[model samples]
Target: AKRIIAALIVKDGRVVKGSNFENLRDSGDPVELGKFYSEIGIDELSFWDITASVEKRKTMLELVEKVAEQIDIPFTVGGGIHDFETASELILRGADKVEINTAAVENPSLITQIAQTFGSQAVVVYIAAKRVDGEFMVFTYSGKKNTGILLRDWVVEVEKRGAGEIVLGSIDRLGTKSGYDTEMIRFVRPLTTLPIIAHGGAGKMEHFLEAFLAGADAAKANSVLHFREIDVRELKEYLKKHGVNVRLHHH
Candidate 1:
């Protein structure tokens, strides 16, 4: 079965193991979950130290090293990566890519610098979709703050900054079981040729299809996959059966 690539989101230095407002209280360590998914064979893994911005810290290299010690596949680290040195440190610690949200929005040139120093393919810009009034608005600061930049404009600007890929996250739809934001994905696809990773609103495997059909290059889910409600491997099978060109991870 063919489907878009999938990424498992790790937040707050932990994997959001359970679906509850408070389950995120301490959460599960991202490195632990990274290793688990790596063993199960995922196309890619993403670790976002969700609170790193507020805390003003870089991704935990200890955790990165811990996961890299056991996992053999590609993984990316996000959050609190404000500069080239911080990003370089993550790559040196074994991250294939570094996700920048607030930092990228605040300093658009950081993308160009990281791309120039580490190659464009290793830099990813993460955007958050927040519903303002009845429409989705692009927000930065880990989705907690608004950047006031139109999502499409931000996409073009980031590409100009040399980002190789974009990770579009729907904050309002996150873990909402509503499925990927089709309109958001549709808006982004035509704006740039960089690979887009659609995230949030995935309650079922069908949502994955919806994301791809809507024009996303990839789809990512955390709550659904982490809770075992949807199996990543089976999702790929379903996508393939549905005529979506997706690559399956090694089992």
Candidate 2:
């Protein structure tokens, strides 16, 4: 079945949501929020330390451990994973997958290094991009630096470097409640075999299915879920109606 993921944008240990990562709105405790989603059966639970890289700190390892202890779903963690040692530490703290973003841009081989150490299945590369001169140039350090790397170019590079998944997200649509950057999602879909988890612009249920139809293997939810606009079951029901394969019930 296709996947619907939860992204807990943890900034300084508390879950927060924002528009383009600019307006930081506190949601709740990360561990509580994480367990709530896992309890409801989200396909995957992703904890992104949004400020870690910008502040040059580490992923909240203790928080990850607590969430892991409470949840049963596949878990992924990101932020401040500057080297294999930090990546491995995240895994050791119970992350099923470790995501590399800014660090990946700074040292491309970190992707291969993590893949070699934990296997490609555990390597996830998160790309935050916005169109510039018609090319989706990537951003780093919490979507601040416009790294000028073409989105079309980076997906191929990540796959070649052995990333198991690509979180093809855009800095423009992020938390705007507009819609997924299907054009961006569709653009990268044809270029790589790696699974694309669409992040940004998940305003409604149709948006999720639309992303899948546009070639996203999975979709990530932030404000949409954080605000309880639609529960997971309702989303699954709606997606199912549109012939999108999704898990119907969760224990």
Candidate 3:
């Protein structure tokens, strides 16, 4: 089934964006927010320690533990996961899947290692940057490295390396509510068979449906979600009405 995943950005202060995020409200505590989504029937939850990865520190395992304890759904955790041990620790600490970005680019084999040990279904490779010009260039680490790598090449390589899923998005699109880069999603659709998630540019309910039509298996709701402008269950109803296979929740 298609999925509506909530990406909870646990930065030093994501909810700190009262002024930063267009006058959005304090998102409240993530743990409770996560539990709320779980009960309301969000398909999956993706937790990203956005600031931690760039600062070269941990990915907030304790936060993951806290969120996981409350939600009875698939939890994918990412950021600052550099090695096998950190990935293992994330899974042991209640992450149903481990999401990697920079480390995977620096050490492509890391994708294979994680997939082999935990199974491919437990691996999520976040394709962080793609600024199309000549060949859809990829960025890493800072989401600004401009790795000079071709997006299609990397997508094929990661899929071969055993990545079970891909979260494709651009920082430029984030917070824009400008809608998804469905063009990018379309470009990558044919190169690999793994599930691709449209991340970071969800602007409206139609945006999610657009991604699905463009071949994305899932859509990540960020700003609209954090800003409390839309509800997960409500989004599902909208998607279902438009003919997307959104999961139904009972009880």
Candidate 4:
């Protein structure tokens, strides 16, 4: 299965764009950038609020609502989501799916509740992975806290809890674009039957294929797309030509 998705990362309420930055100010608003991608015809748009809940704040749903209203496509909200309350609210605010990372790691049952209440299709669990000395470890709290949770344990738990999708992000490869952590994807793909979205380490179109061939259902790129290094439409076309299933952004 070949599916491609794009994300609009938001930071500090402005649509400042950067794939990776050493400076905090360089990270811009995800919603505004999402609006831009939406207008340009992206197949899907994602809003990853870098600092929403860790600061004990809600995901700027009001701003998300504004962006969602303008974009007529499936949009997902990630980052800063720490509980069912936030998840429920963001979904009501127009998010097709609510992505949780830290919260889900701490309270695994929240996945079940979210699925039961909002349907599994609306729940996405984001995993921050790092390969430490040949073993992959899952981290939480904006990738700041490591629960010592191995990738397998957490994936099984969340899947049992009714998570519809898994976002396997490689922090080590993030922003570097060396390539996706296909080893991670391969490990998760056979572990469960649900869809997995491979995030991070995509510098070119070939990385997308590596993700899929390694068993990811969909592939996501942030730096490549945000920097305009690769056009979403052209990527989709390439995937289609290569016998991968994809949806094109209709202008």
Predictions: Cα RMSD each: 4.8, 4.8, 4.1, 4.7
Error of 1 at 79 (Å): 1.6
lDDT of 3 by residue, 124-235 (tens): 9988766757568788885768888888899999999999999897676777888888888999999999999998778778888999999999998865876667767778
lDDT of 1 at 235: 81
Error of 1 at 80 (Å): 1.4
- TM-score, candidate 1, is 0.85
Tell me the spans in candidate 3 whose CA falls farther than 4 Å from its real position.
Answer: 12-27, 50-59, 249-251
Worst 10 residues of 1 by lDDT: 18-27
How many backbone collisions does model 2 have?
0
Q: Model 2 — TM-score against the truth?
A: 0.89
TM-score versus the correct structure, for each prediction: 0.85, 0.89, 0.88, 0.87
Which candidate should be chosen as best, given lDDT against the real structure?
Answer: 2
Whole-model alpha-carbon lDDT for candidate 2: 0.83
lDDT of 1 at 149: 73
Highest-TM-score candidate = 2
lDDT tens per residue, model 1, 1-251: 22233354455455544332233333355555555566554677777665545443543666677777777777777767788998998788877899898888888899999999889999989888776876667787656777677776888998988999899998878868988989888978899989999988889888888888889887776767767688767887888899888765435
lDDT (Cα atoms) of all candidates against the true structure: 0.75, 0.83, 0.81, 0.78
Regions of candidate 2 where Cα sits further than 4 Å from its true position? 17-27, 50-59, 249-251
Tens digits of lDDT, candidate 2, 145-244: 9988888888889999999999988788987889999898878889999899999888888889889999999999877787777678889888898899
